[PDB]
Amino acid sequence: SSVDQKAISTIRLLAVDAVAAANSGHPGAPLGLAPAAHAVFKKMRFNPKDTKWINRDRFVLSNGCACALLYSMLVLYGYDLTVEDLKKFRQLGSKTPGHPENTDVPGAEVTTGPLGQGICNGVGIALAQAQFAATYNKPDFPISDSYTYVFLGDGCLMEGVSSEASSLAGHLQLGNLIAFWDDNKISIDGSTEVAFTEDVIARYKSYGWHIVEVSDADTDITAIAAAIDEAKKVTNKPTLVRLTTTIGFGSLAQGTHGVCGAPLKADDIKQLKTKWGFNPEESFAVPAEVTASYNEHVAENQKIQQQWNELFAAYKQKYPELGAELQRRLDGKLPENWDKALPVYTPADAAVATRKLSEIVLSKIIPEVPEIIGGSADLTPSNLTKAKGTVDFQPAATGLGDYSGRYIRYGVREHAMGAIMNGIAAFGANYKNYGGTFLNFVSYAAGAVRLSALSEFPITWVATHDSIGLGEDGPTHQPIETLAHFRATPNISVWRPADGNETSAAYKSAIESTHTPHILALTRQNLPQLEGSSIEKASKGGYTLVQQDKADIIIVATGSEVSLAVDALKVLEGQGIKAGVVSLPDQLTFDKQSEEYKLSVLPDGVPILSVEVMSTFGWSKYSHQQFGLNRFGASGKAPEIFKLFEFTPEGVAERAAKTVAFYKGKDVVSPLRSAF
Amino acid sequence: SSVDQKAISTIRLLAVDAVAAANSGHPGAPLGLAPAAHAVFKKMRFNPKDTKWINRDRFVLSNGCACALLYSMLVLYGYDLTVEDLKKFRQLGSKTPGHPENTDVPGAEVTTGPLGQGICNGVGIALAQAQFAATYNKPDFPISDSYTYVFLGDGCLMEGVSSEASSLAGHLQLGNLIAFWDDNKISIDGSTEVAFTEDVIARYKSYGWHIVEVSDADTDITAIAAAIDEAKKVTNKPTLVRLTTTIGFGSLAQGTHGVCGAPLKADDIKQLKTKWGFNPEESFAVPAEVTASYNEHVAENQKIQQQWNELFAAYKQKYPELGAELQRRLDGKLPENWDKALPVYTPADAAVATRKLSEIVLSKIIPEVPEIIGGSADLTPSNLTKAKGTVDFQPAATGLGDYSGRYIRYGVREHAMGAIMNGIAAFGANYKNYGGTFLNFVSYAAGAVRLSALSEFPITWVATHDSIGLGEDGPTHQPIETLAHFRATPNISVWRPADGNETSAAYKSAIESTHTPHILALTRQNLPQLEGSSIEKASKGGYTLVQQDKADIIIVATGSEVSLAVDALKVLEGQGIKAGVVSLPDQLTFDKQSEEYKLSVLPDGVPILSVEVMSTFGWSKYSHQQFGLNRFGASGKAPEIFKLFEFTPEGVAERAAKTVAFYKGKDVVSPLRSAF
Ligand SMILES: Cc1ncc(C[n+]2csc(CCOP(=O)(O)OP(=O)(O)O)c2C)c(N)n1
Ligand SMILES: Cc1ncc(C[n+]2csc(CCOP(=O)(O)OP(=O)(O)O)c2C)c(N)n1
Ligand SMILES: O=C(CO)[C@@H](O)[C@H](O)COP(=O)(O)O
Ligand SMILES: O=C(CO)[C@@H](O)[C@H](O)COP(=O)(O)O
Ligand SMILES: [Ca+2]
Ligand SMILES: [Ca+2]
């Protein structure tokens, strides 16, 4: 219609003008996708004034560099984002950053831009929706029936992470996921003929996706809407809608890679506007008829949400227990005193691997906290991430699980597991979700892990086999750089618990988290229960395990090296050296403590030696000398590897004694002191 | 035949016995794949006594946990690996580590185990072979005509990196790549029905691969050999051979996930041996008839290599220039004085972004060093990785390039680009190959990058847009943790050149490298030519740029922050503070210098402040105080971001002055000093 065309032109020109004002950014895909964005948002249920409505449809822009398009949609629909914000596109401190950030942009469900992530986030949103609906929906009470709409480009389809997630989403028959491929035959290097000639459609059919092809997505918004209708009929397959578009549609440079990621020339913008009936002298024009048309859809959606609120109230009357649970989750609140389920240990209990302590924690807290779900990337019997008696998340048609299940079989797909976890957290409803693999292969998922931190999502990696302690699998499996990498990433809690109490503290942090992803570095090998550990002390991230007034040295250690440090203390005593021991199960949590608390753990006037069997990077924040492993490991029985590298009570004692001698007659201040 | 069956049983039992002796490891896939390994090695051309013969067929075990199978093959064929080594499987210091390592295992082309890597390495070996053959082959001189055989499992097929590489390998029509899928319907979590139900075959057809299906790969070695013959007829498609096998074939626990990764029970091993005609009381049995049969094939292969050597000698007679070039490369030697092509700059030259300096270096050295090839992951016009006038590596049938081309269009496939680079280096012939992306997205390829370091491959990442200096794309694009991560990985040179001379030094290191991967962290933004820089000094990794006898402080910086440090020196002079400046373009290279050299750069008795606009991790090796960025970045014009975070001459000067005050009346020793 005339107003549809005008809306599409408005979107296109807002995006182009935003890029022009910044003299930076990507106008091509916004021009090519504005018809589809118009059609999809008209089909979506959402409330610009309540971005957290749990039964909203979700939209994810996986091709995040097209975000001038997303921002234009959000402005036009009256989210908390204005034309003045668009005018500050890509400007320092603005609400319109160069790639969409869920923490900064109202209506941005996730942080995208790194290619491949958004579509996987969409799989996770759709996974959560299916699980949520199976958990809460009752006859006559469709509490959850929302869709997940994803836009993606060729770039996302080239990134392996999207293949992983698309395979898994097809396997999981996620019929409320509808993704749209911007099939514009152009990427940054030029035509896709130079690097991307696969039959995408045949590939997606091989995953079990439904396909709808829209041959003229530059203009045929009727076919785009019909493709959504068709997709919604196919309740047991995610759908890929092939949008054949011209990148930069309308531009003089349409269909060229130059329109991909540079501002258009001024004269190009003038002819765009004139051909579409706009004033070439005007920027950021918003015809009131477009606002009005969009406001009609908002009003209708707000009435749908109003009715949903009444449906929820009637739900709480009919299903008081489920209803109260749901309200609690939508309030962002864990069950009262849920943490009384955390296992507690004493020094009289047996040695246990922290992977096994983790299993035991999950077995106790999963029954108490329904919003915990999680899985493993094909390492369930090694990470120990499933609680006996839970059922797998599977479409019931397979006979292998149900959508009400709580345990996800991710397969050998660490990267997509990371990004799917981000989408599950993004869904909301207080989901506290986790994913298991070996610590060394969390690195396969770095692209997503970093976005967990940037997005402030409380996801949890259950990262077992944390060190040379795993033994025979050898240096291809043994972390060296991994903790340093993730500790150097802002906003990642990297817990390396030493024993049962510390593992309960780690999970207490990970589950209570609302804005910080967690990585739990867990052992293959057994560790003793420590004298002096508790959930309370370990919850401070770092704490004095063995207090030694008159210490000649303090040894600060994590995980499996805390027990080693305690054994070294006994060797040192025989050498006439008095040591204290600090356990530092999470450096981030410790960092957040008060300066006085931190100085009580790492005081002035005593040399401090760190001990952790991987990179020494970062450890100078907490120590004067560092005993770590800065070379790759070895394939052998773990105790022999530790002996080889002198991570023995005697080897630690030797380096502690050298540290005491090194600082003899020097003044020593806490590593916590800084010049600035 | 009878001896074929006996060889297959020998292989199976060597593998099972190796796992049994270690009481650790994976017997299931070795049992299921021994028939195929027997058939493939019989088709392969190789010399156990010359593992570097450049026209050998290559074999890659992508499912590296099956390496008891690889080791058994290598022992049986008389590589420098014995039955005594097998008996030390997974034992500290042995030549039979738990996953195959090219540095430790004769006949292991690459380091595998991390799933997905090997098949991508195979794509790279096959890419190099195609390029090598196109470069050197002449009529009547098939210098290079070898195949690349890869075994892989379901796990590798689930990992996104293999999808990337398989898409690209199909695009590249790599007809000498033959991969074999162990289709045994089992992974660690159980049946593949729980997580991996895609139509693998249809997917591979969608990439343009040829398919051969072997329905009984437990016994039909005739069909496996015929599938190789068929694959070799299809010269314009890589082939996937579907091997339908029983995991753990023969074991009481065959076809169960328990046979995947745990030693078999002793009684199981007894019945294996009895059913196949072996002595259940005997371990590591090697029937001499199997040795003999295998030695016949070796002798035939050695005669093929002998004839190849004569073909090469005749080649050098007919094509003296090409022949001498080829001999030089097979000797591992760069062209004499190739480095005289490196650009050199003075302080009178204009400011240049180090990405552009990189382009200029490549434009000068590519014509001089034919063994340089490389590409970009769809960022060619942003990384600036193509030299004008080179042609792309493409099958000529596309019209878009030729296999003699030297520039690879990797598409948006960073992880596979990493692992393909490892395979290109693994091919040998002195290939010095590179791959461009933004530094922040090198992290997508961490799984492969770590294996570059562990494998000692001289690959090069051309990693542009290294910091907040890139500006508007914002925090999803700006590295914070990235250098710390890779610097904390053993054996990665992480060059962050400050100017033209330093960028030439970085490439001199990267191209001369034979055992160390390089990451070149390069700027989007322009940087000045520094007074005091040179290729000679920067080649030391760290060097005194501005010497100040009587320094009150030394500022050590890298890349874009070296110019900042020099500007801070001028501010400090006005505040009555004398500073020196150290440039540290590669910490690893610097670390390898003599202790006296390093102390001349970072002396005792002077506080040292580091300045680098990302994580402060690692910097305490070189400084007393660290000025870095330990939070995510921001979307804005780069100079405004630097101002926001006070990476300005005044902000650096302020922190330098606080550092001088902090150490007033303290004794200061070089950060290079250690207690142990
Ligand atoms: C993981 C990752 N790699 C590389 C980039 C850089 N990049 C942004 S867009 C883009 C091109 C992808 O092309 P396409 O998705 O087809 O976008 P279109 O040009 O059609 O808008 C690339 C390589 C990125 N943002 N993330
Ligand atoms: C990147 C990566 N993720 C996880 C692992 C752990 N792992 C080793 S084998 C394996 C199972 C893969 O199953 P499959 O390849 O089908 O091997 P099969 O059991 O049939 O021998 C897993 C998950 C790994 N080695 N590398
Ligand atoms: O080794 C691998 C990865 O290649 C897995 O098969 C697990 O390592 C199984 O062993 P556990 O450590 O769980 O006992
Ligand atoms: O921004 C992206 C990645 O999303 C690319 O489109 C490049 O950033 C293009 O800009 P230059 O920095 O090369 O000028
Ligand atoms: Ca495209
Ligand atoms: Ca399998």
Side-chain angles (χ1 to χ4, degrees):
Chain A
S1 84
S2 183
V3 179
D4 288 311
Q5 298 174 25
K6 187 94 186 180
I8 289 169
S9 301
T10 302
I11 293 160
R12 283 177 163 151
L13 297 169
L14 285 177
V16 160
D17 283 337
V19 170
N23 197 30
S24 176
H26 307 78
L31 287 163
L33 287 169
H38 170 74
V40 172
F41 274 71
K42 278 301 178 60
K43 293 264 175 196
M44 280 172 52
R45 300 314 183 184
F46 57 87
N47 187 353
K49 316 309 179 200
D50 183 6
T51 54
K52 294 302 116 172
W53 172 37
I54 202 70
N55 201 34
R56 71 193 181 272
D57 294 324
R58 279 74 171 174
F59 178 82
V60 180
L61 185 75
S62 192
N63 51 328
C65 61
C67 61
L69 172 67
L70 172 62
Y71 300 158
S72 292
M73 302 311 291
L74 297 169
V75 169
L76 288 172
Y77 272 112
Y79 287 75
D80 184 28
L81 200 68
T82 65
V83 162
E84 289 309 303
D85 294 318
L86 285 182
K87 288 180 178 178
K88 300 187 293 190
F89 182 59
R90 281 169 169 254
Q91 296 320 295
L92 186 70
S94 85
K95 295 168 71 170
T96 46
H99 297 85
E101 294 182 73
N102 63 294
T103 59
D104 290 27
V105 180
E109 301 286 350
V110 286
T111 296
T112 56
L115 292 167
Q117 301 288 330
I119 175 60
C120 301
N121 302 150
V123 172
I125 293 169
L127 197 161
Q129 188 282 322
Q131 206 280 335
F132 192 73
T135 296
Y136 293 108
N137 286 8
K138 294 290 191 179
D140 299 327
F141 290 97
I143 298 303
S144 179
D145 56 13
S146 54
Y147 290 84
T148 302
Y149 295 94
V150 184
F151 282 10
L152 73 164
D154 300 314
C156 288
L157 292 174
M158 281 182 262
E159 285 288 3
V161 70
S162 75
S163 281
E164 294 176 16
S166 296
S167 180
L168 179 62
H171 169 72
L172 291 173
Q173 297 182 26
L174 294 175
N176 286 30
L177 176 61
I178 307 165
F180 302 77
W181 166 32
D182 188 12
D183 172 27
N184 62 18
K185 296 176 180 57
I186 293 283
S187 72
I188 284 191
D189 271 24
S191 163
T192 55
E193 287 301 294
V194 308
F196 182 59
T197 48
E198 61 171 63
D199 189 341
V200 170
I201 295 310
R203 180 160 62 89
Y204 269 79
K205 288 183 171 200
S206 83
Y207 299 143
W209 287 53
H210 187 57
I211 306 295
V212 190
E213 301 183 296
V214 177
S215 63
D216 176 12
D218 292 321
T219 68
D220 201 344
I221 57 173
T222 297
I224 299 173
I228 293 163
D229 294 340
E230 178 176 334
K232 290 191 173 184
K233 296 174 182 178
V234 183
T235 54
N236 67 338
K237 306 177 180 195
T239 297
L240 185 66
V241 182
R242 181 192 189 173
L243 298 177
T244 295
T245 75
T246 308
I247 187 176
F249 181 91
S251 165
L252 298 175
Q254 73 174 13
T256 70
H257 73 88
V259 91
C260 171
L264 306 183
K265 307 301 177 299
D267 64 294
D268 188 12
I269 294 173
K270 290 176 196 174
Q271 66 83 28
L272 272 190
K273 285 171 178 172
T274 57
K275 70 206 292 169
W276 291 335
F278 284 62
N279 182 351
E281 301 188 359
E282 183 177 7
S283 66
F284 299 97
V286 179
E289 57 259 64
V290 173
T291 298
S293 181
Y294 278 22
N295 283 345
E296 290 180 354
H297 180 49
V298 172
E300 292 186 19
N301 286 346
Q302 289 169 333
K303 288 310 184 175
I304 290 159
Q305 181 181 358
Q306 176 180 325
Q307 293 174 82
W308 185 89
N309 282 340
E310 296 312 303
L311 183 73
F312 184 41
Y315 184 83
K316 294 200 251 200
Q317 300 286 114
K318 191 174 203 329
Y319 299 101
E321 301 80 12
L322 282 170
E325 172 176 301
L326 183 52
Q327 178 68 55
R328 178 185 61 66
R329 292 177 62 161
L330 298 179
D331 290 343
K333 296 184 181 177
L334 289 164
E336 223 197 341
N337 300 128
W338 74 276
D339 57 310
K340 299 280 247 299
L342 293 165
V344 169
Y345 295 83
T346 80
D349 295 323
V352 191
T354 61
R355 66 171 168 160
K356 178 65 177 189
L357 295 162
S358 174
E359 187 190 71
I360 293 164
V361 171
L362 295 168
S363 87
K364 300 313 181 184
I365 67 175
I366 279 170
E368 300 296 315
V369 187
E371 60 258 54
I372 297 174
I373 65 179
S376 169
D378 199 48
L379 285 168
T380 296
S382 300
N383 303 154
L384 309 182
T385 35
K386 185 171 176 182
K388 188 215 160 195
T390 56
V391 297
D392 291 354
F393 182 86
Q394 302 278 14
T398 62
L400 298 173
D402 183 67
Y403 286 153
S404 66
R406 298 179 59 188
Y407 192 75
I408 304 156
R409 302 290 179 169
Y410 282 100
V412 196
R413 300 180 182 103
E414 299 81 8
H415 200 177
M417 176 173 76
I420 288 166
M421 284 199 276
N422 287 335
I424 293 168
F427 179 86
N430 217 41
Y431 271 114
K432 309 296 185 167
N433 82 115
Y434 68 87
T437 184
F438 293 156
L439 176 58
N440 199 48
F441 301 136
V442 178
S443 304
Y444 271 46
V449 175
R450 181 181 183 51
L451 286 163
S452 307
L454 184 56
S455 304
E456 300 179 14
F457 287 146
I459 61 80
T460 301
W461 286 81
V462 179
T464 70
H465 295 56
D466 74 315
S467 81
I468 48 158
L470 71 85
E472 289 89 336
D473 281 343
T476 59
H477 281 56
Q478 295 159 346
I480 298 291
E481 73 287 6
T482 320
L483 301 187
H485 169 196
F486 294 123
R487 287 166 171 159
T489 304
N491 196 35
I492 309 190
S493 263
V494 177
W495 284 81
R496 193 173 185 248
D499 72 353
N501 290 332
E502 295 199 0
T503 303
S504 280
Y507 271 103
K508 194 176 188 293
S509 185
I511 299 304
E512 282 177 357
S513 182
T514 55
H515 285 80
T516 301
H518 281 57
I519 298 174
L520 276 45
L522 303 167
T523 64
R524 189 184 188 230
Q525 75 274 21
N526 294 341
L527 298 177
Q529 304 321 312
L530 297 165
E531 178 74 36
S533 72
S534 59
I535 304 179
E536 162 62 30
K537 289 192 180 69
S539 76
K540 306 293 173 188
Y543 69 99
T544 301
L545 183 72
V546 179
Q547 173 60 42
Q548 173 51 77
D549 309 313
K550 314 295 183 247
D552 300 298
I553 187 167
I554 288 167
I555 305 170
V556 58
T558 66
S560 48
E561 280 67 76
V562 178
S563 58
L564 175 57
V566 174
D567 286 344
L569 184 162
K570 198 71 166 59
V571 176
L572 285 167
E573 208 168 57
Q575 303 179 5
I577 292 169
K578 293 177 174 183
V581 176
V582 166
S583 182
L584 192 46
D586 181 29
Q587 301 185 346
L588 175 54
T589 295
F590 179 69
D591 282 355
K592 294 172 171 168
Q593 301 307 310
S594 70
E595 304 301 313
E596 209 299 281
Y597 177 78
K598 294 186 289 192
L599 201 72
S600 82
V601 173
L602 301 174
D604 302 304
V606 55
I608 300 174
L609 169 67
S610 64
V611 184
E612 177 181 83
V613 69
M614 48 194 69
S615 177
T616 54
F617 274 37
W619 271 105
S620 60
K621 301 165 58 178
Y622 310 113
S623 61
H624 296 102
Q625 299 292 310
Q626 302 79 40
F627 184 25
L629 184 61
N630 291 306
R631 54 152 284 175
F632 287 115
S635 179
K637 296 179 199 301
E640 295 176 20
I641 306 174
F642 275 76
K643 289 167 199 169
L644 177 68
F645 297 132
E646 297 180 9
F647 285 88
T648 63
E650 299 69 24
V652 172
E654 174 180 289
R655 288 159 175 85
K658 288 186 188 173
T659 298
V660 169
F662 187 78
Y663 290 106
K664 183 182 172 58
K666 300 176 183 177
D667 286 305
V668 179
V669 310
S670 172
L672 297 170
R673 311 289 191 182
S674 190
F676 51 85
Chain B
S1 84
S2 183
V3 179
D4 288 311
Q5 298 174 25
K6 187 94 186 180
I8 289 169
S9 301
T10 302
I11 293 160
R12 283 177 163 151
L13 297 169
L14 285 177
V16 160
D17 283 337
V19 170
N23 197 30
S24 176
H26 307 78
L31 287 163
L33 287 169
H38 170 74
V40 172
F41 274 71
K42 278 301 178 60
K43 293 264 175 196
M44 280 172 52
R45 300 314 183 184
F46 57 87
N47 187 353
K49 316 309 179 200
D50 183 6
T51 54
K52 294 302 116 172
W53 172 37
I54 202 70
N55 201 34
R56 71 193 181 272
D57 294 324
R58 279 74 171 174
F59 178 82
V60 180
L61 185 75
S62 192
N63 51 328
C65 61
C67 61
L69 172 67
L70 172 62
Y71 300 158
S72 292
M73 302 311 291
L74 297 169
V75 169
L76 288 172
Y77 272 112
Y79 287 75
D80 184 28
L81 200 68
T82 65
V83 162
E84 289 309 303
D85 294 318
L86 285 182
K87 288 180 178 178
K88 300 187 293 190
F89 182 59
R90 281 169 169 254
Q91 296 320 295
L92 186 70
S94 85
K95 295 168 71 170
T96 46
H99 297 85
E101 294 182 73
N102 63 294
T103 59
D104 290 27
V105 180
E109 301 286 350
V110 286
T111 296
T112 56
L115 292 167
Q117 301 288 330
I119 175 60
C120 301
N121 302 150
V123 172
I125 293 169
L127 197 161
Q129 188 282 322
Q131 206 280 335
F132 192 73
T135 296
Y136 293 108
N137 286 8
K138 294 290 191 179
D140 299 327
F141 290 97
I143 298 303
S144 179
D145 56 13
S146 54
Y147 290 84
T148 302
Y149 295 94
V150 184
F151 282 10
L152 73 164
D154 300 314
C156 288
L157 292 174
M158 281 182 262
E159 285 288 3
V161 70
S162 75
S163 281
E164 294 176 16
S166 296
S167 180
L168 179 62
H171 169 72
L172 291 173
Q173 297 182 26
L174 294 175
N176 286 30
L177 176 61
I178 307 165
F180 302 77
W181 166 32
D182 188 12
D183 172 27
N184 62 18
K185 296 176 180 57
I186 293 283
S187 72
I188 284 191
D189 271 24
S191 163
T192 55
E193 287 301 294
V194 308
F196 182 59
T197 48
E198 61 171 63
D199 189 341
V200 170
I201 295 310
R203 180 160 62 89
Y204 269 79
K205 288 183 171 200
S206 83
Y207 299 143
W209 287 53
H210 187 57
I211 306 295
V212 190
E213 301 183 296
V214 177
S215 63
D216 176 12
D218 292 321
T219 68
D220 201 344
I221 57 173
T222 297
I224 299 173
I228 293 163
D229 294 340
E230 178 176 334
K232 290 191 173 184
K233 296 174 182 178
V234 183
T235 54
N236 67 338
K237 306 177 180 195
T239 297
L240 185 66
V241 182
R242 181 192 189 173
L243 298 177
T244 295
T245 75
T246 308
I247 187 176
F249 181 91
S251 165
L252 298 175
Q254 73 174 13
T256 70
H257 73 88
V259 91
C260 171
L264 306 183
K265 307 301 177 299
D267 64 294
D268 188 12
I269 294 173
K270 290 176 196 174
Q271 66 83 28
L272 272 190
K273 285 171 178 172
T274 57
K275 70 206 292 169
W276 291 335
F278 284 62
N279 182 351
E281 301 188 359
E282 183 177 7
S283 66
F284 299 97
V286 179
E289 57 259 64
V290 173
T291 298
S293 181
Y294 278 22
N295 283 345
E296 290 180 354
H297 180 49
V298 172
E300 292 186 19
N301 286 346
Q302 289 169 333
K303 288 310 184 175
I304 290 159
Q305 181 181 358
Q306 176 180 325
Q307 293 174 82
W308 185 89
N309 282 340
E310 296 312 303
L311 183 73
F312 184 41
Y315 184 83
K316 294 200 251 200
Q317 300 286 114
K318 191 174 203 329
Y319 299 101
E321 301 80 12
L322 282 170
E325 172 176 301
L326 183 52
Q327 178 68 55
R328 178 185 61 66
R329 292 177 62 161
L330 298 179
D331 290 343
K333 296 184 181 177
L334 289 164
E336 223 197 341
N337 300 128
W338 74 276
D339 57 310
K340 299 280 247 299
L342 293 165
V344 169
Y345 295 83
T346 80
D349 295 323
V352 191
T354 61
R355 66 171 168 160
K356 178 65 177 189
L357 295 162
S358 174
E359 187 190 71
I360 293 164
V361 171
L362 295 168
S363 87
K364 300 313 181 184
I365 67 175
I366 279 170
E368 300 296 315
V369 187
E371 60 258 54
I372 297 174
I373 65 179
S376 169
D378 199 48
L379 285 168
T380 296
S382 300
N383 303 154
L384 309 182
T385 35
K386 185 171 176 182
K388 188 215 160 195
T390 56
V391 297
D392 291 354
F393 182 86
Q394 302 278 14
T398 62
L400 298 173
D402 183 67
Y403 286 153
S404 66
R406 298 179 59 188
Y407 192 75
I408 304 156
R409 302 290 179 169
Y410 282 100
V412 196
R413 300 180 182 103
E414 299 81 8
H415 200 177
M417 176 173 76
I420 288 166
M421 284 199 276
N422 287 335
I424 293 168
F427 179 86
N430 217 41
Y431 271 114
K432 309 296 185 167
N433 82 115
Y434 68 87
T437 184
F438 293 156
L439 176 58
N440 199 48
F441 301 136
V442 178
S443 304
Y444 271 46
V449 175
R450 181 181 183 51
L451 286 163
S452 307
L454 184 56
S455 304
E456 300 179 14
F457 287 146
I459 61 80
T460 301
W461 286 81
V462 179
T464 70
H465 295 56
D466 74 315
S467 81
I468 48 158
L470 71 85
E472 289 89 336
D473 281 343
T476 59
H477 281 56
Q478 295 159 346
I480 298 291
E481 73 287 6
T482 320
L483 301 187
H485 169 196
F486 294 123
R487 287 166 171 159
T489 304
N491 196 35
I492 309 190
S493 263
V494 177
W495 284 81
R496 193 173 185 248
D499 72 353
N501 290 332
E502 295 199 0
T503 303
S504 280
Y507 271 103
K508 194 176 188 293
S509 185
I511 299 304
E512 282 177 357
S513 182
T514 55
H515 285 80
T516 301
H518 281 57
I519 298 174
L520 276 45
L522 303 167
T523 64
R524 189 184 188 230
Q525 75 274 21
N526 294 341
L527 298 177
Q529 304 321 312
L530 297 165
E531 178 74 36
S533 72
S534 59
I535 304 179
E536 162 62 30
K537 289 192 180 69
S539 76
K540 306 293 173 188
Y543 69 99
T544 301
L545 183 72
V546 179
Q547 173 60 42
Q548 173 51 77
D549 309 313
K550 314 295 183 247
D552 300 298
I553 187 167
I554 288 167
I555 305 170
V556 58
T558 66
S560 48
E561 280 67 76
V562 178
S563 58
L564 175 57
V566 174
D567 286 344
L569 184 162
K570 198 71 166 59
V571 176
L572 285 167
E573 208 168 57
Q575 303 179 5
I577 292 169
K578 293 177 174 183
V581 176
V582 166
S583 182
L584 192 46
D586 181 29
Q587 301 185 346
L588 175 54
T589 295
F590 179 69
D591 282 355
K592 294 172 171 168
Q593 301 307 310
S594 70
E595 304 301 313
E596 209 299 281
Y597 177 78
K598 294 186 289 192
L599 201 72
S600 82
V601 173
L602 301 174
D604 302 304
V606 55
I608 300 174
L609 169 67
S610 64
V611 184
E612 177 181 83
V613 69
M614 48 194 69
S615 177
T616 54
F617 274 37
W619 271 105
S620 60
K621 301 165 58 178
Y622 310 113
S623 61
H624 296 102
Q625 299 292 310
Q626 302 79 40
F627 184 25
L629 184 61
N630 291 306
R631 54 152 284 175
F632 287 115
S635 179
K637 296 179 199 301
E640 295 176 20
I641 306 174
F642 275 76
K643 289 167 199 169
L644 177 68
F645 297 132
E646 297 180 9
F647 285 88
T648 63
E650 299 69 24
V652 172
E654 174 180 289
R655 288 159 175 85
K658 288 186 188 173
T659 298
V660 169
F662 187 78
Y663 290 106
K664 183 182 172 58
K666 300 176 183 177
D667 286 305
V668 179
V669 310
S670 172
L672 297 170
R673 311 289 191 182
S674 190
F676 51 85

